[PDB]
Every structure is written in structure tokens, then in C-alpha cells.
Symmetry: D2
Subunit: 440 residues, 4 copies
């Protein structure tokens, strides 16, 4: 699946619809980023700029100009073509091919932006700009507006109103179109295949990073070159660290391993967590914690639908958690009192769900305490976990256990669709998968 030319056009038009007449919106590309000395990290476009263009070059600026309710045009600033720079660092779109390729009306050289941008903003009333997003962008925008402010004898006037478009654009990104959902559906499948493979390859004596290598190879073979975030492979006590990315330890028979990993496919993030026994067989103590986390996930998957909220489903998870932990003797007391005291928090100290899309922790307003009423088209994670510290004052057998189980869902008219259920999470199914792999 991919995003069409037409879809990028629709998105620009939907932004322009919300803009005041006599205004321009300025959306800037991500800068290139040094890794060390003269080597740079693989380029990652700004998600908002990508959303409106599908254009993967730096030194580019999308300018959407609204004259009135039925009249608007698009201008792209981008890198000029250059035989020498392209023989070295790779091909460029340039100005000639850009209108047709990216569906914009006009394309100018980014090297001329300081000579041209103020002319495009002259006489407008409003400019939409994400101030503080990038320092280079602020320099360009402030420089244009100062030229206009100070150029009254050349009959120039600056727009007096500046509006942050991030609220508007993030509210758009919060609701996925059918095309976006198809892409995320494939991201979830790719990510699932990677997690299945990690379970199948895991053996005692392999290092945490070996499973990372299997996962990344699987992403790559389906055309997802990069992960959406740095892969987490926390075996044993490392599973109690939420963003453990060192992945440097030998995996030991008897330990669990927690894998949080997700691909980036056409810009969109997969995001799955599976926790499983390194030796393919859960112990009793491991099952006892795992079952609480799994019931939490399974109950949440049943509950999530239009009209509820992350907050409301999180309350059900807290209840399941506090009850399970009391039954194991990890918590002591009255369930309802422990719930009122938030007694689960030493063991489950993060949110159940985040928005998912072009960023793994996606944009969009959550409402106070994530109380926003869910509607169809919202995409989110469901990721309960329990993390018992090596030195928690609890029965010995539960100490140093970290378990998270995470699926990615889209809210539908009647409930939700699970994008990541093609990798197993029921303990008996995990064990059968690993046994089958160890034969073959």
C-alpha cells in the first residue's frame, strides 16, 4: 500500500479550507543531521512536511497561499539541480520536474528563498508558521517579516498575525484516511512477522542484540528499511527498564525477554511489544504476572470503541492489575482502597495507550488525563505492562520481571480493528511457536 498523489492534494486542500483568506502557511523540511564528523544519519523528513508532500529532501519549504474561499496556490522551495552535487550525494527533483511530480503550482530554488519569501508574504494578513520547530526556519521567516515591516517606503507590509498551524495539522493527522489505515495495516503485518521471527530464533546464549538483528532484517526484507524507534530487547532485569536499548546482554535460560520494536513503512509506524521465555517455556511465576498483563490487553481490546476513552479503559486495567497483584501477595489490602491509592504505580508507571501514525508517539490532543472521547479513524496502541524491580519488597519469585504486551489498533464505527494480532500473545501459543521452531 502507498499514499496517492491525490491524497497529498486532498490534505493540502483540507488545510487551506481552515486557513483565513489573505494568508500563507509555511511548512519546512527537516535539516540533515550529523552522526559524527562528516557522516550523517539516514535522512528522516519532518512528519508534517511529509504529510503534505511525500517529498524526502532537505532544504525545502511548502508555501500554501490562500487569497480567498475559492482561490489558492502552492509554491515549493527546493534544491536546484546540480550535476556535481548529484554525482556525489544523489539525485535531486529540482524545479522543472516538481510541479508535476508533487502536484504544486510553482517551484523555486531554495537558494533564492530569502529573495522570494517576503514577496510571497507581502500584503497578506496572516502567516501560519510553527515557531520554534527549527531554528533555520525561524531565521528565514523572521528575516522575511522584518524586510516587510521596515519596507513601507517600498510599499511593503508584513502580516500582523502569526498562527501556529501545528494544532490544526495535528488534529488532521489524528484521524487516518482509508489509505493511511491500509499503510498502517501493512506496517503492523511487517512488524508482526518480525516479532514472530524473533520468538522463533531466540535461544539461550544469544545476545539481546541478535534478536534486534533478526527484527531489522525482517523489516528490511518487506521494504521497511528503518525502524520507527530504537528497538528494545530487555531480557531479565533489563525488562524493567522501559526504553532499554543497550541490548548488550547474553540472554539466559530462565529469563523472559521483552521486545518492543516497530518498523517504519511509507513513513508510518508499527509498534509491537511481545514478552516471552528465552527457553520457550514460561515458569509458574512468569505465567502469574504474564496473565495479568494479557487479561489487561485482552479486556482493553474488547472495550476500545467510539465513545469510551483511554482514561476509562485505563481504569479497568488498573482494577485487573490491582486484583491480580493482591491475589499473588505483591500488594496487600482492600482492592478498592489500593485502587484509590493508585497502588499499582510502582509496577505499572506508564500510559496504556498512545496515538500512532507518522510518529510512533503520534501527534493529536489527548484531553486532560487522556480523557478524550474516541472516534472512528483514531489509531492507538494498547500496551499494559508490569515491572517488578529486582529489589521490590515482594515474594522473591516476582523480582526482576518486566512484561509488556502491545498491539496497535484503529477505532472503527462499532469497535476496533487489531493491526498486530498476526503475532501470537497467548502463552500456550507462544510456547507452541517456539517448540515448533526448535524442531525445524
Amino acid at each position: 500500500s502507498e499514499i496517492s498523489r491525490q491524497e497529498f492534494q486532498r490534505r493540502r486542500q483540507a488545510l487551506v479550507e481552515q486557513m483565513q483568506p489573505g494568508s500563507a502557511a509555511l511548512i519546512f523540511a527537516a535539516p540533515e543531521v550529523t552522526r559524527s564528523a562528516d557522516s550523517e544519519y539516514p535522512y528522516r523528513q519532518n512528519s508534517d512536511f511529509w504529510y503534505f508532500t511525500g517529498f524526502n529532501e532537505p532544504e525545502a519549504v511548502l508555501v500554501l497561499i490562500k487569497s480567498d474561499d475559492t482561490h489558492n496556490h502552492s509554491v515549493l522551495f527546493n534544491r536546484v539541480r546540480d550535476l556535481t552535487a548529484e554525482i556525489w550525494f544523489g539525485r535531486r527533483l529540482g524545479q522543472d520536474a516538481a510541479p508535476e511530480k508533487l502536484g504544486v503550482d510553482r517551484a523555486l530554488a531554495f537558494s533564492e528563498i530569502n529573495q522570494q519569501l517576503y514577496q510571497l508574504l507581502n500584503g497578506l494578513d496572516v502567516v501560519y508558521h510553527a515557531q520554534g520547530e527549527y531554528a533555520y526556519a525561524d531565521v528565514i521567516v523572521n528575516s522575511a517579516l522584518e524586510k516587510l515591516r521596515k519596507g513601507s517606503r517600498q510599499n511593503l507590509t508584513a502580516p500582523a498575525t502569526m498562527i501556529d498551524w501545528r494544532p490544526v495539522v495535528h488534529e488532521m493527522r489524528l484521524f487516518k484516511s482509508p489509505e493511511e489505515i491500509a499503510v498502517l495495516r501493512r506496517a503492523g503485518e511487517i512488524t508482526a512477522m518480525a516479532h514472530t521471527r524473533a520468538m522463533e530464533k531466540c535461544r539461550p546464549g544469544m545476545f539481546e542484540y541478535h534478536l534486534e538483528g533478526e527484527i531489522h532484517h525482517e523489516f528490511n526484507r518487506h521494504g521497511a528499511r528503518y525502524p520507527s524507534y530504537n528497538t528494545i530487547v530487555g531480557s531479565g532485569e533489563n525488562g524493567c527498564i522501559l526504553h532499554y536499548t543497550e541490548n548488550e546482554c547474553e540472554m539466559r535460560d530462565g529469563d523472559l525477554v521483552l521486545i518492543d520494536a516497530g518498523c517504519e513503512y511509507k513513513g508510518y509506524a508499527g509498534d509491537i511489544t511481545r514478552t516471552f521465555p528465552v527457553n520457550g517455556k514460561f515458569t509458574q511465576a512468569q505465567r502469574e504476572i504474564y496473565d495479568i498483563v494479557l487479561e489487561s490487553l485482552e479486556t482493553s481490546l474488547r472495550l476500545y470503541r467510539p465513545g469510551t476513552s483511554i482514561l476509562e479503559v485505563t481504569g479497568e486495567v488498573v482494577r485487573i492489575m490491582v486484583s491480580g497483584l493482591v491475589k499473588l501477595g505483591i500488594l496487600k489490602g482492600d482492592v478498592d482502597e489500593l485502587i484509590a491509592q493508585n497502588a499499582h504505580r510502582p509496577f505499572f508507571m506508564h500510559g496504556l495507550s498512545h496515538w500512532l501514525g507518522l510518529d510512533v508517539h503520534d501527534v493529536g490532543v489527548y484531553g486532560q488525563d487522556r480523557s478524550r472521547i474516541l472516534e472512528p479513524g483514531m489509531v492507538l496502541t494498547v500496551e499494559p505492562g508490569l515491572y517488578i524491580a529486582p529489589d521490590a519488597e515482594v515474594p522473591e519469585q516476582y523480582r526482576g520481571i518486566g512484561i509488556r504486551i502491545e498491539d496497535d489498533i484503529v477505532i472503527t464505527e462499532t469497535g476496533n480493528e487489531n493491526l498486530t494480532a498476526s503475532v501470537v500473545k497467548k502463552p500456550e501459543e507462544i510456547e507452541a511457536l517456539m517448540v515448533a521452531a526448535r524442531k525445524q
Copy 2:
């Protein structure tokens, strides 16, 4: 292989030996780097800071203070320990464990650096600082020196002399110790195994990125998690682009594929290029160009030794190249005149050799035109190539061919040691390797 505690200590002492008495050297860690929104790229330490510490955290500063020829001490600023921040983002060394772990005399909280650094610089005559390396470092250093300048009524004085330590430190990095050479030797082996595997896996109809995935998986399985630079897989005309990293094309029977890829192992870069037929059999036209590049490499490997230079060996390569191209009718005229006119430059437009180490394009002075006399301990690449443009005015059969062949070497007392010869480059050996793999 690894770098010892003792070696990091030796390096600090070697820097201190060159410092003026009554001085302090300030070496800052790399900042963390955003990939998108709240997600960050995998952390890569500043190579110079790494060189003196082997410490892989941000928000850290090494301060080496020389009182006199026999008296000096080391101070580390680093992140304080924090239970909440470590449960989330992973473990920290802290101040208690640092002296023993990293062999420094004292360790302070990076959060206190503005309160402490000026006190360490007070009364000194010289400060060694890499001005403009990082903006956060300059803010910290300039702020310390202003406090001292303006604090004469508190009996404070700033050092009046500031010296860039990069020349000194890069000159040290230019000459590798036995330990560094052992590490680079393993980086070369790992990188070679990856390239061998790419040749063995290549089939028509696979995408360029599939070979990238094989290479990265192989790096990872030997404990080199990351590449030293973004992998290049240029098949067909893409091989004429020097840093082609899109790797997005279907590999076609009849084309060559150029792979430039290198692992990062204990901080040190491997860097190999192999070019080979996608279908496992070089055509006549492909052999004709390949043989010129291979003779260039093989002649260079014979010539490189103490007392010659990159410039001098490059002259021999130009001669081989111009002669080969004249014999094919790609160039026309007298060889010596064509050489004098640099007629090879449309086809070979980059340097033959760069320094190699903690950075793939490593630090160290080259001398004018890379004329510096080579000495034992220098590590460098040998990477001749020929790139015939799709639209070059040459016989049709050579158009759109890009071939580079690259090995990594260390200069020894009598010649050089080749770190990357365990992956084949002779055409008959390449073909046999691919045939054997295709059976299986």
C-alpha cells in the same frame, strides 16, 4: 578485541604531556539527536571524547588539568543517578562509580557544571577548547570565562590564551596503537564477511536494499550493531553516484552492483567496496573496466609503504587508468598528454585513499594534495574507481558502468597489512563464489 582501561589512561597522559603547565583541556560529549518528534537516533558519542574515555553517555565533559610537568588530574562532569530517569531511559554511571570505572580522579554532576567549571579554570594561563565544535559547549565555556574576567573583586582571573586541541588530538588519532589495529583488524573481518554474504545472496529481482539488510544483519551478528556510514548499494547506473544510499531499485540481470559498506566495531570503522555482477558473470565490457580498477588497487597495495604518499601512489593509478581507457577507446590521444591534462577526471573524480579510524573519513593532516609521507601506524583506504556516465560520449557498452574496489590497510615497518583481503576481488574468484552459493 577491545581498548583497555590502561590505553585510555595512556592517551590522556599523552595529551597532558603536550599541554602547557597551568592549563586545562575541555573535551565535551556529543549531544543527543532528534530523529522525529520525541524519538532520537541511536546515540553516537563524539569520537574525540570517546578516544579519551570510552564513555557512551551524553551530558559529559572530561577536564584534564596540568599544574606542571609532573602534576595533573582529571575531572569528569557526567549525569547524576536518578531512579525515575533510569527506569525510563536506561542506566547511568553516576558520580560514585565513575572514578574507578573510567580511571578519572574526580567526578561531578553535569547539572553543576556552570557552578564548578569556572572554579577549575580560575588562575590558569591556558584553556584547550575546540571552539565551534558544539554550541552547548561554547555557551558553557564562554560563560565560565566571563565569570572569571568580570570577577576580579572576588580575586578571579581568566586564562588569556585559548588553544584548539583538535590539531594535537587528531595527530594522535592518526597513528594507531597495537590495540587499535587489533580492533580495526576485526572490523575489517566483520565487514569482509558481510560483503562475502551479499555476493552469495545476490539474485536478479532482489532490491538493492535487500543486500543492505544482509550486510547489516552480518555486522550485528558479530557484535557491530551499527554501520560506520550509510550503506551504498548502487546497481546499474546507480553505481555512477558516489554516495548512492536510496538503495530502492530492483537489481537487474546484466547489471553490476557496487556495494560500499562498513561496520562500526568498538567505535572503529570498517570500509569496503566490492562491485560484482548481479547475475554472477561479468560481461566482456564489465571485465574491461573492472580489470583497470583492480590493477589500480593491486598496484597500490604493492606500492603503499613508509616513505611514499597518497599523492605519489595516486599518480601511478592515474597512469594505469589513462592507459586502460585509451586501449578501450574511452579516451583518445597520447597517454602522457592525457595524463598531463588530467583526462581521467570525468571517470575517476575522487581521492584514492582516506584516513580510517574512529571516523570512516578519519581525522589527521593529509598535507597539500595528500602529499604527506606515510609512516607506520597510519591506517587508510585504497579505493580506485571508474564511473562512466549513462550519457558519456564513449562506446555504448561502457555507458552507465560504476565500479569501485576498496580495501582498508595499515602501514607497517616494511609495507602494509591488508585488513579486508578475506573478501574476494579477483573476477574469477567472485564468479566462483556466486556459482558455489547458487548451488548450496
Copy 3:
């Protein structure tokens, strides 16, 4: 005359009337300014901040908050009281006395602004801020808005709209109240007395700066400590330099002297130019040029009224000028053609009139080519001049003559009131004044 507490209150309310509901306006004080090393220039408050407060301290910020059409409040950030800092550098208002003294609702310590400002902006929709006016102000404002943007988990939201209040506030300043006109009337009288005195004191052999000293002493004795701009005393060829402030030459019998000087009285600028003979008697050649400039001024004073514009009156002046210069043989040809060719421009190369108020070149929109229709309450200068270069190709007797004559006026219901007519400008009256003084 002075500006009342009530007037400052009215102005704030008039700004608040124009503000959107759910908004705050931020008006910052001028920074202190170094003259050399640790000595500073006499403090000059930002004119806009002064306009709303009459408060003459740095490190102060006026915050006007509009909840709705009938509900708003004012917050002042200002310097805390400090016995040591006040014994040294002088008295401070502080927070206790400020509400009553300056008519604001609340006053907080400027040292706490970063801890408090974001709390005042939280939940608002709009912030009025003059971006780029002062760098310290932008740092404070951007820092507040970033706290709000990134603080959604603390239930903070930033206003998405930022509006430049300078257009609104400058449009207010463009129309003077009766109180402001009374103050400017006194500024014009003070400035006139100074110019009268300079004419009375002028003798051949005195230096240009001596007349500057007389003028400044006269400003000071009426309670106008500072000039509104750097005083111009251009004798001879120095009169051809528009902002000649060197004032370093011996004044010579036979030369004219051009004095452009104005006091600052309760913040408001006087601005007068008189040109006169150093020896008290105009030559024929001097009269011939002077009469053109004087007719230009006198005709303009008759014409200026509601309904005309600076542009329209400037056209009449150009006609007078071109005609006078043709009659002297300084220009040659048809008057109407010379007018169409703007043939006056080598001799009169500046505007006839600028707005006058808290700044000598005051704020307010002029319209294209200063075409804005004049209305009652506008205050402006009328300053025709003719400047014949030392090397102009004109009859010898006119070379090196610079003459400007300038009065300050306020537009009334039926015409204008001249604020500066108490210093003579008719040549016979100038000569009589100087003769009388020489006896003284």
C-alpha cells in the same frame, strides 16, 4: 503641562478595547545601553512602554489581560526594591507602591517573570507581542510559550495566535489628545526659545558646537534635560549635509548656519530648523535661496488642513522650488517639464513633513508616498530645504549653500496650529533680532 494618571489609564483601556477576548498584550521596557566600559547612556524608555505607563525604569513589562468585553486586568513586572542597589544606582518603585503609583492591578518582581509569565498566558487564545523589538523580550516570550506548548500533561496550553500590537498602538499614537498637544505646545516653545538664543549669541569665530551648548542649556533651564535627537549646527558647506552632527568648525563671517535642534519635554519632541547668517546680514545670493525655502514653508503652513495630504502639499512646494530655481538660473528649461522630471531632487532630496510625537520621526502609517488624508490631531513637521553642493554646476554664488526652515504643527478642525512660530523666520526679523542682540 504633563500627562495625567487618568490619561495613561485611558490609553490602556483604548488598547484593551481593540484586543480580542481571551488575550494578553506584552509591552516591554527598553534595555539599558552601554556608552563605554561600565558607563551607560542616560536612560531612555521605550516610547510605546512609556505611552502606557509613564514609568522610567528598565526591566519592566506591562501585561494587559482581556478575559472578555467587560473584564480585564493589568499586571506589571518591575524591579524589586533593594537597599544596596538603590544606595548605589538610585531609587526604585518596587512592587508595593506600583499599583497605586502607576494604576495597575498587580505588580510582580521582574526577577520572577520566567516563573510567572507562562501562567498568565496559559489558556489564552491570542498574545499581542512586538516580535523582534528587543531580543531579551523575545527570549522571555518564546520561553513562556514553549513551556505551555510542551506542558500538556500539566494541563497547559499556549495561545496559537500571536499578533503584532505595533500597528494598533502606533495608530493610537498618531492622533494626539488635548493633553499631548499641550505638552508638545510647551516643547515647541522651549525649542523656539533655544533657537532664538542661538541667533542672539552667534558671532563669527565661535564654533558650531558653541551654539549647540547654548541650545542645550536653554532646553535644560525649562526642564527639558535632553534633546529629542542629536543637534545639527551646519555652517557653510556643512549645511549641505542633512544630519551634520560633528559641529566642529569655526563659524565664518559670510556663511550661513543651519540649526536643526529639538528638546525632549515629558517624552515629547520639539523639532525646529532655522538657518541664518553668522554675521547677522543675509547676502543677496543667500536671500535668493532663503526666500524660496521660506515661501515653501509659508505656503505649506497655509495649505495644511484636514483633507489634504503631505503628498499634495509637497507638490505645491516642488512647483515653488522649480520656479524659484529657474528664475535664478540654477535650473534651465520649462517649469512643467522640469517638475515632471523631478529636477528639484539634486537640491531638495528629503520629505517635507514627518509625524512628530514621542519620537521626533514619529510612528504612524503615511500611506503610499505620504498620501494619507490628514485629520485633526495629527502632529507633523514642515521642513522645506534647498542644498546646493559645493561642486554643483550652477552660478558660483549659490554653491555650498544649505538652507532648511522647519516648524512643528498640529492639524485642527479648520487648519493647523503652529507650535514653533515664536522663533522668527522672516529674514528681516532674523536680522533685527541679531542686530538688537549685538547692541545689548
Copy 4:
């Protein structure tokens, strides 16, 4: 008196003598400074730049290049000539006239500095630059050095050592030449005449600012256009504020007035304080405090000579002060104990003496607690004072009295020369001067 072409040349040569071979010193002009909107304060050149040039324009840079012990040259960057900009804002030296006018070898356009400065620094070992003095200068210098650092393929190298020249140059400025002393001698005379005049003009009912006007007029008439610092006229309780510059109060019969005022003559500061009765007759209580301050001054004038220090003379003043105050009942106890407890500090809370020159509080190292041994050529103030707060718990008659008496001196071979003794300070002489004036 003035400073000769030859003297400016000597100073540059004296700096070059101390510079390392293969180095360049960069001395930047002061930026222009806004007073309000488009009006600027009178230009004040950077004192160090002035010291080496006597050049009073902005956008200028002196570059002194030392090749070796007998070979060096000077380059000036300055504003190009421009007919339009000079007709408006006044005459410019330009490049043609500068070598001869300012005694430099070469002069280039400041508009070309970024294209030329790096070429002048290329291949040098050391650059002398006052980092953090001006932000525009740092931008220019850092930009030049980055070009050199990164331009090794164009055979460019940056100097690795940067040295602050301020210590060296301020140490030079600390010792005045005969020419400088002659200029300061005239500054002291001018300043004295101004103070004499203020005493002669003072009447009850005049405002503090009226005496400021008399003083400034007197500075101006002797060719000192500007004061060296903002004039202090503190009558009554205002005399207890050390830098009282409001000068806004009606002077009352019965009060003292403290005037601290100094001219700037050819760049050099006068700096005198005289305190006197507004009505021309000291009361008993006023005499009692005045006599302590006067004895302090007179004893200091006797003591100051080569071989003592400000610290040592300050100890004698403290003794005189504590003894006088004990005798009046302002302090109670044993003199030697009160001295040991620094019991004078509520009443005398500033230093006795500061260096004087191109800045009123001049550059130069004081040593710890101003303990530096005085040598011939040092110029300094002697300014004891006693300030009894309105609410000090002392006998009523001394409350609200501020008295300072200040003279400017130069250390000679055998003692000191008093530059400001031509204005009276003995109380009987003050009273006679005022009585004589009142007749005017």
C-alpha cells in the same frame, strides 16, 4: 592639547612588540547605539580602538600583523565612501585617504571584511582577539576561523591559538604618556571651571538639573562636548545615593549639594566631586562631617606617591574617618576595635580611588584589594565620602547628609600632581566664592 599621529603609531608598535611572531591582533570599533526608534545616541568609539587609531567611525577594524621581530604591517577595514550616505549622515574617511590620515599601511572596505579577513589570518599561529567584547566582532572572527579550519583542500590553515589582548592593552593604558597627561591636565581644568561655576550659580529654589546645565555648558564652551559619565547633582538626602542622576529636585536652603561631574576631552575623562551648601554657608553639623572628608582627601593627597598603594592610603582614611565619627558620637567605642570591625562601612561603602583615563573608571589591574604598588604615570581619583542615611541611628543633625570630595591625580617620580585643585574645597574658600558670586 591633543594626541599626535606619532603617538598613535608608537602605541601600535608597543602592542606589536609584545605580540608573538606569525600573529595578528584584531581591534574592533564600537557599534552605533539606538536611543529610540531611528534616533541614535551620540557616537562613542570603543576606548581601545580609539587608543590605537584616534578614528571616530563605526564599522571599522584595525588589524596588526606581525610576521617576525622586525616585520609587521597594519590593515584598516572601514566604511567605503558613498555620496548619498554622506549627504545624509555625514562625511567618511574612506579607503584612499586612510593610510595617510591614520598612518596605516593598507585600508579595505568593511563591506568586504568577510571576504578578506580569513585571507589575512591564513597560515598564522596566533590571533589576538577580545572574545565577547562585541557580538558582531565574534561573528566576524569565528566565521573567518571556520573558513580556514574547513578549507584544508584549498590549503588554508587557521591559527590554533587565540589570545585576549585586553590584559596587555589595558596594562599599556594604565601608564599615561606625557601627551596623555597634558590632555588629562586640560580635562581637569575644564572640569574644575565647570564645578567653580556651579558653586557660583547655585541659589535656593533652583533645581538640581539647573546646575547640571551650567556644568555641561562650561564643558562645551572649552570644546568638551560630552561628559565622561552621567552628571550627579544630589542635594539633601539625594547626596546619600552614590549615582543619583535623576537631578529632579528643587534645591532647598539648609541642604548641601553633592556634584560629581566630569568632561570628556579628546577621549579622556575629568572626574571631580564637590559638595557645598546650597545657601553658601555650611552649618556646624555640615562642617563636622565635611572636615572629616576633607582631612581624608588632604591626607591622601600628601600620601600618594610611588611605592604605596590605594589599599595602604585607604587604611589611613578609615582611621581618620572612624576617629572623626567617634568624636561626633556617630560611632561608639574603641577606635582600633571599630577599625578592626570595619565600623566605617555603613557611612563610607565605596573605594577611595579608581584608575582614570579614556574611561572614567579606567582599565588596569588593581591587585587584590587594590594593593598594587603605585608607579609614576598611573592616574587615579581620590574621593573619600561620608553618607549618613536619613534613618541612621545617629544624632539627628547628621541624618541625610551625603558628602564626597574628589580630585584627580597623576603619580610622579616623587609624589603626585593634582589635576583638579583649581576648584576650591576648603570650606572657608567655598563660602567666599559663593558670597563673591552673590554680589557680582
